Amino acid sequence: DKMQLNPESADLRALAKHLYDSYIKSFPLTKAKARAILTGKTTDKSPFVIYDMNSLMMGEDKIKFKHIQEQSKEVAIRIFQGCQFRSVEAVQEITEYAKSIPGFVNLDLNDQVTLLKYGVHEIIYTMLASLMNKDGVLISEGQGFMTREFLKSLRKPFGDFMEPKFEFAVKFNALELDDSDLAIFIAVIILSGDRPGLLNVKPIEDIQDNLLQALELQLKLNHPESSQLFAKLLQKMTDLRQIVTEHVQLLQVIKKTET
Amino acid sequence: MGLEAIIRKALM
Numbered sequence A: 001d002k003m004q005l006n007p008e009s010a011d012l013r014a015l016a017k018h019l020y021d022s023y024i025k026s027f028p029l030t031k032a033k034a035r036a037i038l039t040g041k042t043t044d045k046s047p048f049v050i051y052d053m054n055s056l057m058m059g060e061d062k063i064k065f066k067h068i069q070e071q072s073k074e075v076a077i078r079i080f081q082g083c084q085f086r087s088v089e090a091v092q093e094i095t096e097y098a099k100s101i102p103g104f105v106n107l108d109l110n111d112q113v114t115l116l117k118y119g120v121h122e123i124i125y126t127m128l129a130s131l132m133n134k135d136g137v138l139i140s141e142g143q144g145f146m147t148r149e150f151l152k153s154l155r156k157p158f159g160d161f162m163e164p165k166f167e168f169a170v171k172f173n174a175l176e177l178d179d180s181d182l183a184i185f186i187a188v189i190i191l192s193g194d195r196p197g198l199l200n201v202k203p204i205e206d207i208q209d210n211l212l213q214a215l216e217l218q219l220k221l222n223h224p225e226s227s228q229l230f231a232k233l234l235q236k237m238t239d240l241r242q243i244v245t246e247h248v249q250l251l252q253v254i255k256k257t258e259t
Numbered sequence B: 001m002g003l004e005a006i007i008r009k010a011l012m
């Protein structure tokens, strides 16, 4: 038929394996290790759960997103300053992963910055779904857990801040992807040839076509029940750009009235 | 440090 064990198909399985190994060393908290925490399938001393204001104030008497602090006594902004803090940390983790993509470092150095400039947001929201469920999201490298309703119980600008990510994560986690699917999918997002300001679009697309081939074979082998999952995963790349747009539109309110 | 010096830094 179509799928066969040719030398070309093995090279796509070797690329998937290579990207998976760099996916483990670059990103400390993987999905499989995060799902075991959420479903209690592990024995990691049962991390803390922040579900209201009393659990937040009491839970902060243990090392948390207050790393460096005495900034922003208000809890609505202090939580938001923690998300942007680890987001910067996620930029360095994604960039270290991008270096392991075959051909990424061989591109123009300015294009490498451009691909990561407009790509980190979509990957931060993709990998955040691995830390989420219907109840909340793992925080502080799995040592905490902030509920979805407590985040929504914040003020008007900050209450709807995490909710679009939860609504994406519910439908995205329903696809039941593992780390082997996400590693290639993340590499496809980086090698996007439609980023603004790209100098050499052709060699970026030549790598993405190679990543798409590896992602196609991956989802066919790993997911026999979900036909057209490769098609569904590409449409999710359009869900992500709306989360980025809603996040930018949320930052407009901060400049307007937040003094 | 506006998301461009951070990526430039990590890209040694």
Ligand SMILES: Cc1c(C)n(Cc2ccc(Cl)c(O[C@@H](C)C(=O)O)c2)c2ccc(C(=O)N[C@@H](C)c3ccc(C(C)(C)C)cc3)cc12
Residues within 6 Å of the ligand: A064, A065, A079, A080, A082, A083, A084, A086, A087, A088, A090, A091, A120, A121, A124, A128, A137, A138, A139, A140, A141, A146, B003
């Ligand atoms: C990476 C990440 C994690 C692990 N969670 C869960 C999470 C929940 C609650 C708390 Cl309190 C938290 O914080 C401490 C506990 C921690 O992470 O362990 C963490 C996030 C929640 C929201 C956002 C986000 O939407 N971030 C937006 C505002 C942005 C900001 C800046 C950028 C650039 C640097 C690329 C410009 C990109 C996206 C990012 C993350």
